[PDB]
Structure formats: C-alpha cells, structure tokens
C-alpha cells in the first residue's frame, strides 16, 4: 500500500530518529515492505523444493525459508539501503555433496520462470570468513509482472552442502551464544576468526569445492589443532548445543513461568578438585537481566567455572527455528575437526 520512495523515506526517518505518530507510520511503511517479501519467499521455497525433488529423487535435500523479523530490520536501520536489500527473504537448500549442489544450481539456472537470477555468488572457494556455498540473488517477477504488487521483489537462495551448513551452524551458534560479533564486524576475536577461516578452507577442500595442496593442508591442520585447543571449540560446541537441547526439555519447560521471555545462564563446572563435573542452565526473568549479568561476571573469579555464557531465550528459539538440525550439524562439524586434528 506504499510507494518505494515512501519506504526509503521511512527507513531514513528511522535511521534519523523518530517518535510517536511519525514512528508508527514509519514502522507501518517498513513492515508493509517486509511482508511484501512473504509471498515471493513462500513461492521461491516451493520453486526450489520442486527443483530439489527433481535433482534428488529420494527427497532428502532440505529446503527452508526465513523472513527477516521487523525488529531485526529496525535495529539495522537504528544502528545498505532498505529497498536494495536481498536478504529480507531467504531460501536455503541443503544437499549431500558438491555434485548434487552443482546439479541443483544448474537446474535453477536452466529453469524458465518470471523470477530472474540477477547475480550468481560463487563461494566454492571460501570467503575471507571461511564460508563456502553458492548464492543466487533473485528478482522475483522481474520483467513479466502486469498489475503485480510483487514485481522486482528480491529473494536470496543459498545453496550449501551438509558439511558447509555444519560449518555455518557452528559459526552462528558461537557468534550468538558467545555474544561476540564475527558476522556483523570486521575486527576483534582473531583466534575465532582465523579458526573459522581455516576450518572453512578444510571443509571446502574435503567437500571438493576448493582442493588445496598437501603442504597447505598440513599447515592448515597444525594451525587448526593449535587454534582448537586454545579456544576449546569442540568442548564449547557440545556444551552450548547440549544447553540448548536442555532448554527444550519437558521437565524444564513445565518448571518455567508462563511465556518466559528471559535468559539462561549456561555454565560448565569442574568442581571435581573428589567432587562433580556438571553443565547447568539457570533461568532468569526479563526483569532480572542485570542480576543475570552480575552472576555471569562473578564467575570470572571462580576457577571451577570453565564455560559461562548468558543466552537470551529469544536468541535460543530463533536459532532452533533457523537451524532445526543444530544438534546433528554441530556434532558433524566437531567430528570433522577431530579427524583433521588427529592426522599428525
Ligand atoms: Cl538446520
Ligand atoms: Na532467579
């Protein structure tokens, strides 16, 4: 119900501060723009699913869709023009191998629909972050439209392999749970960033997306062994994903308050000196945020506390919704890490 100039003006008015009736109109303008991607998003999820079912007759390629939350869009404008964004709507196809990935990419390219691939982002050679896969940026209803309100809606399609998705899930889990910002920054955490780049490169080599020479492989595994022991990646992935699994537990869910929208203080304790070795989740209310931060910072003094992290229940639920197979993906990345670290 709004014009593209009205939507661009509303995004500007949110970046520039807004209040009251002016804000309600601006948030309605951007919310309208956001739910305009819902139809082409659900459409592209079915177009992609149809292609995946022709590529793998066994129906094992996993297809998913995700619409960026209104809250996430406003926070990006508060803290890349709105109408020029390709990530508002995104689809993801997870295939078993590089062969199956290239077949599905070609099936989508050769296909003839009103939905055009504007750019093909080939990341079979890992990005500086370590990420590998292929992204197809679509302009749905690009030329053939008519009285179509969804003319030129941008939807991104990410094609990735089971191991490339295992790498991406583990990155998202460490990034979100450790509260560090690898994805939304170009600085800090050198050991985490370098660990993800090298492991990403090893994923691309193993998958056959970017084969590296024997010497580089050897050097990359020594670097990886060193980075993994320094950061304790395997131990953290197991603890964080088990703690997330524990939040979805029936006994825990019955003990929690109604529509709990708070925090979970995840810990790993070595009180074995003989004592006990445990992993605990402690829930907090939304009002008890500071009390929760005070308990988290108090554990730095405790030598028994090996892992201590504060998780918002909204971050937990969205990670489980965006990565339904996070338990398995994480374990498959740790097994991958283990087989490269035990080489020499
Ligand atoms: Cl998943
Ligand atoms: Na409490």
Residue numbers in the entry: 14 to 92, 104 to 297, 303 to 373
From the paper:
Here we identify and investigate the anti-phage function of CapRelSJ46, a fused toxin–antitoxin system that protects Escherichia coli against diverse phages. Using genetic, biochemical and structural analyses, we demonstrate that the C-terminal domain of CapRelSJ46 regulates the toxic N-terminal region, serving as both antitoxin and phage infection sensor. Following infection by certain phages, newly synthesized major capsid protein binds directly to the C-terminal domain of CapRelSJ46 to relieve autoinhibition, enabling the toxin domain to pyrophosphorylate tRNAs, which blocks translation to restrict viral infection. Collectively, our results reveal the molecular mechanism by which a bacterial immune system directly senses a conserved, essential component of phages, suggesting a PAMP-like sensing model for toxin–antitoxin-mediated innate immunity in bacteria.
To further understand the mechanistic basis of anti-phage defence by CapRelSJ46, we solved a crystal structure to 2.3 Å resolution. CapRelSJ46 contains a conserved, N-terminal nucleotide pyrophosphokinase domain (toxSYNTH) that is also present in alarmone synthetases and tRNA-pyrophosphotransferase enzymes, which mediates toxicity. The smaller C-terminal antitoxin domain consists of a central antiparallel three-stranded β-sheet with an α-helix connecting β-strands β7 and β8. The antitoxin domain is topologically analogous to the classical zinc-finger domain (ZFD), but lacks the conserved cysteines; we refer to this domain as a pseudo-ZFD. The pseudo-ZFD is connected to the toxSYNTH domain via α-helices α7, α8 and α9, and has a C-terminal α-helical extension that anchors the domain to α8 and α9. This open state captured by crystallography is probably stabilized by crystal lattice contacts that are incompatible with a closing of the active site owing to clashes with symmetry-related partners. In addition to predicting the open conformation observed in the crystal structure, AlphaFold also predicted a closed conformational state in which the C-terminal domain folds back 110° onto the toxSYNTH central β-sheet and blocks the ATP-binding site. The crystal structure of CapRelSJ46 suggested that L280 and L307 in the wild-type protein promote the open, active state, with L280 stabilizing one of the hinge regions involving the pseudo-ZFD and L307 structuring the β6–β7 loop that interacts with Gp57 A-domain. Collectively, our results indicate that the pseudo-ZFD docks onto the ATP-binding site of CapRelSJ46 to prevent switching to the open state captured in our crystal structure.
